[PDB]
């Protein structure tokens with residue numbers, strides 16, 4: 001029988017955004033501003049919005065998002081917050097957020113709330129929201145300009161040790177949130193933190209890790225559950241600990257830039273310790289995939305520039321990758337650039353993967369961090385499970401010259417007992433019941449499938465090696481007997497202040513008590529326990545926390561199945577199993593099953 005338990009110690013922001021599914025669908029001005037190297041004129045912003053309203057908003061791309069080139073946004077409120085995107089604009093943020101509302105859309109904003117504009121500093125009448133004693137001028141160290149060393153002289157970096165700083169930062173984050181912004185894209189924090197860039201040299205004065213982590217905590221608290229926090233230049237120190245604790249999205253690649261295959265799949269394949277750890281998103285998504293999933297981070301592959309690619313097969317591959325990784329789907333094509341490529345973004349079955357909350361992982365091959373061993377995960381084969389137990393499976397051929405067969409076996413790789421019905425989502429074709437998904441792919445081509453296991457008597461298996469991992473839980477395959485490619489270890493007592501855990505998203509037809517099974521190993525020499533909960537996306541408890549018991553077994557190569565019962569509500573539940581301070585021993589976890 002199960003006993004009551006205290007809650008697990010978390011190390012992630014664990015917001016409704018990361019719990020509820022994949023990244024958002026949006027449009028960004030980068031397609032105009034990057035090639036023009038200039039801020040988007042207000043009229044071009046308007047024409048793009050109107051085009052989105054008529055052509056893509058109906059496919060869920062209902063955020064229009066500003067980007068950089070913000071040095072020329074100098075007008076501020078009485079408390080130093082920018083009133084518009086650029087000083088050339090006739091209308092303020094409120095006007096645009098409502099013009100967007102009139103078209104069933106929302107405003108996305110690119111800004112860093114640690115920027116303090118020079119013009120605000122130079123107007124001594126401006127003061128910190130709620131702190132009339134602190135002039136905006138009192139928030140900065142003279143000379144401490146963003147990008148100082150490369151000519152920057154319009155934006156200061158905030159000195160977070162100055163009185164009024166917290167109120168300034170938090171007021172800036174709520175300023176946008178209150179305006180109706182569901183998405184804040186925060187860039188340049190690595191330049192803030194250590195004043196350097198591996199692709200340039202010194203850029204400005206360093207501010208240090210402690211200040212960086214404090215600033216993030218302020219942003220997190222200020223954004224709350226209402227506004228999604230995208231971190232665009234994360235240094236990802238300590239396996240991304242500060243970013244995981246305080247953000248929803250992290251960029252995992254160098255900028256889209258001129259786009260095309262080389263940005264998507266080239267440049268360099270190796271890891272480096274500096275922003276960006278990996279240059280291309282195939283490597284970046286694969287490399288940071290251990291940090292993805294419900295309640296952890298959403299990985300951000302940046303912007304899709306469809307007409308920068310060389311073929312329609314490349315365009316499909318671009319989209320398939322973002323979808324497979326659970327990334328935001330961010331269109332950067334303007335109304336002038338889209339040409340005949342709208343179809344890339346609006347395949348309903350492919351979009352349905354993102355809607356249902358697909359967050360795939362590359363096929364794990366070993367426990368070694370991908371940063372140390374590129375053989376440890378397969379950048380070209382991806383799979384993830386939807387809450388209802390169906391799957392998204394994606395296969396890629398990154399060869400420039402050879403046609404290559406890729407396969408995911410449902411028993412050997414995914415760890416299922418049942419096979420599944422397979423639908424090719426670009427062919428829009430049912431392939432029937434099968435034991436694998438496979439494609440002979442031309443160079444740069446891909447395939448993506450919905451795989452739907454049959455459910456004899458409702459039984460649904462969720463393999464742990466494709467679930468979400470936190471607090472030191474991770475993949476291994478170093479004791480035989482597991483179903484699939486491996487299992488989850490690190491569910492043991494540890495140094496850190498976070499508890500190791502695995503989270504599964506599960507979808508059930510009705511409220512009730514459900515039979516749950518746990519395939520595990522435990523050769524600690526004694527019974528082990530784990531804390532199990534069910535929760536709503538908003539974190540509300542549906543069941544537990546309770547200690548579940550796992551009988552000791554002869555060896556680590558021995559597997560067994562513990563039985564339990566769990567109360568789940570209709571629809572989406574997050575079932576999280578982990579090792580708290582009060583739990584005993586350790587387990588390795590292969591899968592859970594629910595009879596629904």
Ligand SMILES: OC[C@H]1O[C@H](OC[C@H]2O[C@@H](O)[C@H](O)[C@@H](O)[C@@H]2O)[C@H](O)[C@@H](O)[C@@H]1O
Nearest residue numbers: 030067068069070071187188232233255
């Ligand atoms: O005004 C800020 C900044 O805008 C432009 O850069 C925007 C890009 O910055 C990268 O760091 C980021 O990864 C990309 O997603 C952004 O689009 C501009 O080029 C730069 O000079 C400005 O300072």
Ligand SMILES: OC[C@H]1O[C@H](OC[C@H]2O[C@@H](O)[C@H](O)[C@@H](O)[C@@H]2O)[C@H](O)[C@@H](O)[C@@H]1O
Nearest residue numbers: 479489490491492493556585586587588
């Ligand atoms: O604690 C459960 C754990 O037990 C066994 O591993 C013991 C330790 O092995 C070390 O090499 C490793 O670095 C430590 O983290 C382990 O605690 C077992 O082999 C492993 O599979 C189990 O998870």
